[PDB]
Amino acid sequence: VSGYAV
Amino acid sequence: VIGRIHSFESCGTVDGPGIRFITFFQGCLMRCLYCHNRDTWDTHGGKEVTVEDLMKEVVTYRHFMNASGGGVTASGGEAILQAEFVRDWFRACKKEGIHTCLDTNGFVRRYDPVIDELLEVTDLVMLDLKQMNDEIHQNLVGVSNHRTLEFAKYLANKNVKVWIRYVVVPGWSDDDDSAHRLGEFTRDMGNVEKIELLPYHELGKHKWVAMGEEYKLDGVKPPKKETMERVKGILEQYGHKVMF
Ligand SMILES: C[S@@+](CC[C@H](N)C(=O)[O-])C[C@H]1O[C@@H](n2cnc3c(N)ncnc32)[C@H](O)[C@@H]1O
Ligand code: SF4
Ligand code: NA
């Protein structure tokens, strides 16, 4: 989930 | 100075030390095939903002930051493209006793004064090294890896607390040659605190789909603990805290 912009 | 951002997570747990307030800036010059924020590329789009506005949000989380040993993180697409705005943001954070983290790809074209000014107010930089082998790099990312490696030299050359991030994708960065190159390259430099490996994950594909663009890595499944394990050792040989 590293660096995941929703 | 105006800031154009995609979005922000008031407090993520996987974007650097502790729990951090992450702001994802809009725009990116690279075109990594695995990019999970494809909707982050476009220079246009995303809301405009001022540091006054940002701090007016980051401060309210002081709690989670202190308690987690976290801080703020500049990421999204390529924050280094809005270097003036970011360094302003860190200057404000520094002045709040807040810890700053810059999550970048290091594709620095011109080494202007603002670069040094940003680094001056930056506590840690999670620099991504996507592929030492440029032949592959140019296809994986869409550009040569020279500017990034230069930025890496630059950093080491100024003793900047660095974390090298190496996203391990099947068939592109999972091979052992590439693992040594990285291990060798970053070995020289001793400012690189550790090497955080990141397993590729299918996610953010719909962002491509939504944009009528084809997600090539479609099908590619995440690497195996065996693989990650292998790479890890290869790099732990050069003596880094290779922690994935
Ligand atoms: C999307 S980036 C934004 C900052 C900068 N553009 C970069 O890539 O370093 C934040 C982190 O997410 C990683 N990342 C992007 N897509 C990924 C994926 N599909 N699987 C695993 N990691 C990914 C990037 O390599 C980087 O370490
Ligand atoms: S550098 Fe980061 S934001 Fe830009 S395309 Fe690559 S993963 Fe996506
Ligand atoms: Na990065």
mmCIF file of C-alpha atoms and ligand atoms in Angstrom:
data_model
loop_
_atom_site.group_PDB
_atom_site.id
_atom_site.type_symbol
_atom_site.label_atom_id
_atom_site.label_comp_id
_atom_site.label_asym_id
_atom_site.label_seq_id
_atom_site.Cartn_x
_atom_site.Cartn_y
_atom_site.Cartn_z
ATOM 1 C CA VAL A 1 0.000 0.000 0.000
ATOM 2 C CA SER A 2 3.152 2.151 -0.218
ATOM 3 C CA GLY A 3 2.583 5.357 -2.137
ATOM 4 C CA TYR A 4 -0.973 4.538 -3.173
ATOM 5 C CA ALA A 5 -3.054 7.673 -3.574
ATOM 6 C CA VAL A 6 -6.755 6.901 -3.547
ATOM 7 C CA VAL B 1 3.514 30.077 -4.556
ATOM 8 C CA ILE B 2 0.707 27.774 -5.559
ATOM 9 C CA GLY B 3 0.671 24.027 -5.053
ATOM 10 C CA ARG B 4 -1.110 21.688 -7.413
ATOM 11 C CA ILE B 5 -1.879 18.439 -5.685
ATOM 12 C CA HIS B 6 -3.692 15.213 -6.410
ATOM 13 C CA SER B 7 -4.659 14.389 -2.842
ATOM 14 C CA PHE B 8 -3.348 13.706 0.641
ATOM 15 C CA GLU B 9 -3.585 11.056 3.331
ATOM 16 C CA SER B 10 -3.882 12.660 6.762
ATOM 17 C CA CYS B 11 -1.848 9.756 8.141
ATOM 18 C CA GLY B 12 -0.451 6.804 6.212
ATOM 19 C CA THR B 13 1.682 4.051 7.720
ATOM 20 C CA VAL B 14 3.680 2.907 4.711
ATOM 21 C CA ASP B 15 5.117 6.121 3.369
ATOM 22 C CA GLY B 16 8.175 6.492 5.527
ATOM 23 C CA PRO B 17 8.963 6.584 9.284
ATOM 24 C CA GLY B 18 5.974 6.128 11.571
ATOM 25 C CA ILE B 19 2.593 7.557 10.643
ATOM 26 C CA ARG B 20 2.882 10.475 8.255
ATOM 27 C CA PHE B 21 0.723 13.112 6.622
ATOM 28 C CA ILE B 22 1.236 12.436 2.924
ATOM 29 C CA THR B 23 0.445 14.926 0.220
ATOM 30 C CA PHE B 24 0.373 13.542 -3.295
ATOM 31 C CA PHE B 25 1.380 16.247 -5.726
ATOM 32 C CA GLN B 26 -0.002 16.370 -9.275
ATOM 33 C CA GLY B 27 2.134 15.610 -12.295
ATOM 34 C CA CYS B 28 4.971 13.289 -13.189
ATOM 35 C CA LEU B 29 7.377 13.134 -16.102
ATOM 36 C CA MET B 30 8.056 9.412 -15.810
ATOM 37 C CA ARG B 31 5.821 6.626 -17.110
ATOM 38 C CA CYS B 32 6.593 3.580 -14.973
ATOM 39 C CA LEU B 33 4.546 0.670 -16.264
ATOM 40 C CA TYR B 34 3.485 -0.334 -12.740
ATOM 41 C CA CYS B 35 2.467 3.127 -11.554
ATOM 42 C CA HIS B 36 -0.533 2.837 -9.271
ATOM 43 C CA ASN B 37 -1.267 6.568 -9.473
ATOM 44 C CA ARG B 38 -1.569 6.876 -13.211
ATOM 45 C CA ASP B 39 -4.089 9.665 -12.664
ATOM 46 C CA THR B 40 -1.165 11.481 -11.106
ATOM 47 C CA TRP B 41 0.755 12.091 -14.321
ATOM 48 C CA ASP B 42 -1.146 14.983 -15.862
ATOM 49 C CA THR B 43 0.358 18.359 -15.026
ATOM 50 C CA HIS B 44 -3.093 19.885 -15.151
ATOM 51 C CA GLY B 45 -5.804 18.753 -12.766
ATOM 52 C CA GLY B 46 -5.845 18.396 -9.004
ATOM 53 C CA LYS B 47 -6.650 21.275 -6.643
ATOM 54 C CA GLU B 48 -4.435 24.340 -6.191
ATOM 55 C CA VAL B 49 -3.267 25.176 -2.686
ATOM 56 C CA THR B 50 -1.037 27.187 -0.358
ATOM 57 C CA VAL B 51 1.230 26.086 2.468
ATOM 58 C CA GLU B 52 -1.077 28.014 4.789
ATOM 59 C CA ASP B 53 -3.832 25.620 3.826
ATOM 60 C CA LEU B 54 -1.657 22.544 4.207
ATOM 61 C CA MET B 55 -0.281 23.377 7.618
ATOM 62 C CA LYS B 56 -3.873 24.211 8.523
ATOM 63 C CA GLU B 57 -4.339 20.437 8.318
ATOM 64 C CA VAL B 58 -1.020 18.770 9.047
ATOM 65 C CA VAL B 59 -0.724 20.457 12.450
ATOM 66 C CA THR B 60 -3.966 18.967 13.725
ATOM 67 C CA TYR B 61 -2.275 15.552 13.457
ATOM 68 C CA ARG B 62 0.829 16.510 15.427
ATOM 69 C CA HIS B 63 -0.314 13.781 17.805
ATOM 70 C CA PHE B 64 -0.065 10.773 15.483
ATOM 71 C CA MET B 65 3.223 12.087 14.115
ATOM 72 C CA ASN B 66 5.049 12.595 17.405
ATOM 73 C CA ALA B 67 3.664 9.346 18.817
ATOM 74 C CA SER B 68 4.630 7.323 15.748
ATOM 75 C CA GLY B 69 7.932 9.024 15.127
ATOM 76 C CA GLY B 70 6.471 10.114 11.830
ATOM 77 C CA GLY B 71 5.989 13.435 10.130
ATOM 78 C CA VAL B 72 4.980 14.633 6.694
ATOM 79 C CA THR B 73 5.773 13.216 3.284
ATOM 80 C CA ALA B 74 5.804 14.830 -0.128
ATOM 81 C CA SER B 75 4.869 12.292 -2.796
ATOM 82 C CA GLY B 76 2.058 11.703 -5.317
ATOM 83 C CA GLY B 77 3.457 11.992 -8.794
ATOM 84 C CA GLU B 78 6.784 13.820 -8.714
ATOM 85 C CA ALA B 79 6.929 16.357 -5.901
ATOM 86 C CA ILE B 80 10.352 17.486 -7.013
ATOM 87 C CA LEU B 81 8.548 19.186 -9.902
ATOM 88 C CA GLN B 82 7.019 21.619 -7.460
ATOM 89 C CA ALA B 83 10.301 22.071 -5.576
ATOM 90 C CA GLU B 84 9.615 25.707 -4.737
ATOM 91 C CA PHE B 85 6.315 24.798 -3.156
ATOM 92 C CA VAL B 86 7.624 21.736 -1.359
ATOM 93 C CA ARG B 87 10.630 23.430 0.225
ATOM 94 C CA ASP B 88 8.229 26.100 1.418
ATOM 95 C CA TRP B 89 6.111 23.389 2.961
ATOM 96 C CA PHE B 90 9.084 21.825 4.718
ATOM 97 C CA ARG B 91 10.328 25.225 5.946
ATOM 98 C CA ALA B 92 6.950 25.535 7.618
ATOM 99 C CA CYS B 93 7.171 22.025 9.018
ATOM 100 C CA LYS B 94 10.702 22.488 10.213
ATOM 101 C CA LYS B 95 9.422 25.503 12.103
ATOM 102 C CA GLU B 96 6.797 23.351 13.774
ATOM 103 C CA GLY B 97 9.385 20.885 14.931
ATOM 104 C CA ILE B 98 7.957 18.555 12.279
ATOM 105 C CA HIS B 99 9.981 15.912 10.491
ATOM 106 C CA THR B 100 10.032 16.041 6.702
ATOM 107 C CA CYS B 101 10.237 13.230 4.164
ATOM 108 C CA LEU B 102 10.521 13.602 0.404
ATOM 109 C CA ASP B 103 9.392 10.592 -1.655
ATOM 110 C CA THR B 104 10.940 11.068 -5.103
ATOM 111 C CA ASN B 105 12.199 9.491 -8.348
ATOM 112 C CA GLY B 106 15.085 11.959 -8.427
ATOM 113 C CA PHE B 107 14.657 12.914 -12.040
ATOM 114 C CA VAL B 108 16.275 16.333 -11.475
ATOM 115 C CA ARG B 109 16.890 18.217 -14.704
ATOM 116 C CA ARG B 110 18.285 21.572 -13.505
ATOM 117 C CA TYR B 111 20.163 21.868 -10.223
ATOM 118 C CA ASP B 112 18.770 25.243 -9.243
ATOM 119 C CA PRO B 113 19.210 26.905 -5.850
ATOM 120 C CA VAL B 114 15.798 25.615 -4.840
ATOM 121 C CA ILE B 115 17.131 22.060 -5.012
ATOM 122 C CA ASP B 116 19.739 22.714 -2.325
ATOM 123 C CA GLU B 117 17.180 24.790 -0.449
ATOM 124 C CA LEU B 118 14.732 21.871 -0.461
ATOM 125 C CA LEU B 119 17.342 19.344 0.634
ATOM 126 C CA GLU B 120 18.444 21.808 3.302
ATOM 127 C CA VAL B 121 14.992 21.581 4.857
ATOM 128 C CA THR B 122 14.522 17.839 4.150
ATOM 129 C CA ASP B 123 15.109 15.266 6.893
ATOM 130 C CA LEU B 124 14.852 12.118 4.790
ATOM 131 C CA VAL B 125 14.543 11.282 1.119
ATOM 132 C CA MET B 126 13.136 8.010 -0.066
ATOM 133 C CA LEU B 127 14.863 7.908 -3.409
ATOM 134 C CA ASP B 128 13.610 5.379 -5.892
ATOM 135 C CA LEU B 129 16.095 3.547 -8.048
ATOM 136 C CA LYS B 130 13.912 1.725 -10.506
ATOM 137 C CA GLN B 131 16.564 -0.046 -12.583
ATOM 138 C CA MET B 132 20.329 0.258 -12.767
ATOM 139 C CA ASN B 133 20.331 -1.343 -16.195
ATOM 140 C CA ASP B 134 19.364 1.584 -18.409
ATOM 141 C CA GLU B 135 18.459 -0.644 -21.329
ATOM 142 C CA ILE B 136 15.611 -1.981 -19.180
ATOM 143 C CA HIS B 137 15.025 1.266 -17.353
ATOM 144 C CA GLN B 138 14.226 3.138 -20.548
ATOM 145 C CA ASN B 139 11.453 0.677 -21.244
ATOM 146 C CA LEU B 140 10.238 0.152 -17.750
ATOM 147 C CA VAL B 141 10.092 3.868 -16.952
ATOM 148 C CA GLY B 142 10.217 5.503 -20.370
ATOM 149 C CA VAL B 143 13.422 7.491 -19.713
ATOM 150 C CA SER B 144 17.113 6.891 -19.086
ATOM 151 C CA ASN B 145 18.190 6.508 -15.438
ATOM 152 C CA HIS B 146 21.152 8.892 -15.683
ATOM 153 C CA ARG B 147 19.467 11.975 -14.157
ATOM 154 C CA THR B 148 18.287 9.892 -11.202
ATOM 155 C CA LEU B 149 21.698 8.329 -10.560
ATOM 156 C CA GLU B 150 23.225 11.794 -10.770
ATOM 157 C CA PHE B 151 20.755 12.991 -8.184
ATOM 158 C CA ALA B 152 21.795 10.011 -6.040
ATOM 159 C CA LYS B 153 25.468 10.927 -6.337
ATOM 160 C CA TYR B 154 24.489 14.497 -5.514
ATOM 161 C CA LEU B 155 22.687 13.374 -2.383
ATOM 162 C CA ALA B 156 25.452 11.094 -1.151
ATOM 163 C CA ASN B 157 27.842 13.878 -1.994
ATOM 164 C CA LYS B 158 25.978 16.011 0.581
ATOM 165 C CA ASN B 159 25.356 13.379 3.238
ATOM 166 C CA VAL B 160 21.553 13.267 2.959
ATOM 167 C CA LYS B 161 19.653 10.709 5.066
ATOM 168 C CA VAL B 162 18.560 8.389 2.287
ATOM 169 C CA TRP B 163 16.383 5.355 1.842
ATOM 170 C CA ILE B 164 16.674 3.612 -1.465
ATOM 171 C CA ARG B 165 13.408 2.123 -2.634
ATOM 172 C CA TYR B 166 13.559 -0.675 -5.163
ATOM 173 C CA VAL B 167 10.219 -1.913 -6.474
ATOM 174 C CA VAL B 168 10.651 -5.541 -7.439
ATOM 175 C CA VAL B 169 8.575 -6.372 -10.487
ATOM 176 C CA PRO B 170 8.601 -9.841 -12.150
ATOM 177 C CA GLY B 171 10.956 -10.043 -15.092
ATOM 178 C CA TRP B 172 12.010 -6.440 -14.932
ATOM 179 C CA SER B 173 13.830 -5.937 -11.662
ATOM 180 C CA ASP B 174 13.746 -9.399 -10.107
ATOM 181 C CA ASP B 175 16.887 -10.676 -11.892
ATOM 182 C CA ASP B 176 20.143 -10.959 -9.924
ATOM 183 C CA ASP B 177 22.344 -8.820 -12.167
ATOM 184 C CA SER B 178 20.249 -5.725 -11.502
ATOM 185 C CA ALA B 179 20.281 -6.551 -7.779
ATOM 186 C CA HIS B 180 24.064 -6.464 -7.656
ATOM 187 C CA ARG B 181 24.313 -3.259 -9.669
ATOM 188 C CA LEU B 182 22.087 -1.547 -7.131
ATOM 189 C CA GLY B 183 23.953 -3.146 -4.252
ATOM 190 C CA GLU B 184 27.219 -2.024 -5.814
ATOM 191 C CA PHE B 185 26.044 1.470 -6.723
ATOM 192 C CA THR B 186 24.546 2.359 -3.351
ATOM 193 C CA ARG B 187 27.434 0.689 -1.502
ATOM 194 C CA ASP B 188 29.831 3.489 -2.399
ATOM 195 C CA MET B 189 27.547 5.977 -0.668
ATOM 196 C CA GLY B 190 27.158 5.665 3.090
ATOM 197 C CA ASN B 191 24.315 8.140 3.572
ATOM 198 C CA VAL B 192 21.844 5.518 2.366
ATOM 199 C CA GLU B 193 20.463 4.355 5.698
ATOM 200 C CA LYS B 194 18.683 1.332 4.224
ATOM 201 C CA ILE B 195 17.157 -0.312 1.186
ATOM 202 C CA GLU B 196 13.416 -0.869 1.363
ATOM 203 C CA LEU B 197 12.237 -3.378 -1.233
ATOM 204 C CA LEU B 198 8.696 -3.069 -2.556
ATOM 205 C CA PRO B 199 6.815 -5.985 -4.134
ATOM 206 C CA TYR B 200 4.900 -5.084 -7.241
ATOM 207 C CA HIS B 201 1.127 -5.104 -6.800
ATOM 208 C CA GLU B 202 -1.671 -4.860 -9.317
ATOM 209 C CA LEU B 203 -3.519 -1.762 -8.201
ATOM 210 C CA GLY B 204 -4.284 1.572 -9.769
ATOM 211 C CA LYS B 205 -4.950 -0.282 -13.007
ATOM 212 C CA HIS B 206 -8.507 1.022 -13.161
ATOM 213 C CA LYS B 207 -6.820 4.423 -13.217
ATOM 214 C CA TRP B 208 -5.394 3.404 -16.590
ATOM 215 C CA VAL B 209 -8.611 1.736 -17.685
ATOM 216 C CA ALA B 210 -10.633 4.758 -16.564
ATOM 217 C CA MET B 211 -8.251 6.623 -18.844
ATOM 218 C CA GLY B 212 -8.710 4.278 -21.787
ATOM 219 C CA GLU B 213 -5.022 3.383 -21.524
ATOM 220 C CA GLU B 214 -3.796 -0.196 -21.554
ATOM 221 C CA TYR B 215 -2.201 -1.522 -18.387
ATOM 222 C CA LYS B 216 0.653 -3.654 -19.749
ATOM 223 C CA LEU B 217 1.554 -5.420 -16.484
ATOM 224 C CA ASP B 218 -1.950 -6.877 -16.600
ATOM 225 C CA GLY B 219 -1.551 -10.499 -15.604
ATOM 226 C CA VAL B 220 1.796 -10.012 -13.931
ATOM 227 C CA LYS B 221 1.345 -11.334 -10.410
ATOM 228 C CA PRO B 222 3.265 -10.089 -7.366
ATOM 229 C CA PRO B 223 6.752 -11.612 -6.856
ATOM 230 C CA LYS B 224 7.291 -14.573 -4.490
ATOM 231 C CA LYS B 225 8.785 -14.349 -1.002
ATOM 232 C CA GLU B 226 11.455 -16.562 -2.523
ATOM 233 C CA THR B 227 12.350 -13.908 -5.095
ATOM 234 C CA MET B 228 12.247 -10.960 -2.701
ATOM 235 C CA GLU B 229 14.257 -13.131 -0.363
ATOM 236 C CA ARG B 230 16.866 -13.763 -3.053
ATOM 237 C CA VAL B 231 17.255 -10.093 -4.011
ATOM 238 C CA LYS B 232 17.451 -9.146 -0.325
ATOM 239 C CA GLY B 233 20.485 -11.355 0.239
ATOM 240 C CA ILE B 234 22.189 -10.199 -2.938
ATOM 241 C CA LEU B 235 21.969 -6.661 -1.544
ATOM 242 C CA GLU B 236 22.715 -7.539 2.068
ATOM 243 C CA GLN B 237 26.084 -8.641 0.696
ATOM 244 C CA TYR B 238 27.155 -5.073 0.107
ATOM 245 C CA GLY B 239 26.248 -4.438 3.712
ATOM 246 C CA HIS B 240 22.971 -2.532 3.615
ATOM 247 C CA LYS B 241 20.059 -2.843 6.039
ATOM 248 C CA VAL B 242 18.070 -4.232 3.095
ATOM 249 C CA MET B 243 14.689 -4.480 4.811
ATOM 250 C CA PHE B 244 11.691 -5.353 2.649
HETATM 251 C C1 LIG C 1 3.823 6.307 -7.055
HETATM 252 S S1 LIG C 1 5.380 6.877 -6.301
HETATM 253 C C2 LIG C 1 5.390 8.692 -6.250
HETATM 254 C C3 LIG C 1 6.804 9.252 -5.985
HETATM 255 C C4 LIG C 1 7.721 9.060 -7.210
HETATM 256 N N1 LIG C 1 6.946 9.329 -8.434
HETATM 257 C C5 LIG C 1 8.303 7.633 -7.267
HETATM 258 O O1 LIG C 1 7.751 6.810 -8.034
HETATM 259 O O2 LIG C 1 9.301 7.405 -6.550
HETATM 260 C C6 LIG C 1 5.527 6.239 -4.584
HETATM 261 C C7 LIG C 1 6.066 4.789 -4.485
HETATM 262 O O3 LIG C 1 5.096 3.850 -5.070
HETATM 263 C C8 LIG C 1 5.886 2.890 -5.816
HETATM 264 N N2 LIG C 1 4.986 2.149 -6.777
HETATM 265 C C9 LIG C 1 4.299 2.697 -7.796
HETATM 266 N N3 LIG C 1 3.563 1.757 -8.397
HETATM 267 C C10 LIG C 1 3.778 0.609 -7.766
HETATM 268 C C11 LIG C 1 3.297 -0.695 -7.937
HETATM 269 N N4 LIG C 1 2.423 -0.973 -8.910
HETATM 270 N N5 LIG C 1 3.725 -1.677 -7.102
HETATM 271 C C12 LIG C 1 4.597 -1.416 -6.120
HETATM 272 N N6 LIG C 1 5.070 -0.174 -5.937
HETATM 273 C C13 LIG C 1 4.681 0.851 -6.739
HETATM 274 C C14 LIG C 1 6.895 3.817 -6.499
HETATM 275 O O4 LIG C 1 7.987 3.068 -7.036
HETATM 276 C C15 LIG C 1 7.370 4.611 -5.289
HETATM 277 O O5 LIG C 1 8.288 3.869 -4.472
HETATM 278 S S1 SF4 C 2 7.807 8.105 -10.914
HETATM 279 FE FE1 SF4 C 2 6.224 7.499 -9.342
HETATM 280 S S2 SF4 C 2 4.325 8.684 -9.921
HETATM 281 FE FE2 SF4 C 2 5.781 8.829 -11.698
HETATM 282 S S3 SF4 C 2 5.045 7.181 -13.137
HETATM 283 FE FE3 SF4 C 2 6.669 6.303 -11.767
HETATM 284 S S4 SF4 C 2 5.546 5.384 -9.979
HETATM 285 FE FE4 SF4 C 2 4.081 6.738 -11.109
HETATM 286 NA NA NA C 3 10.307 7.573 -4.346
#
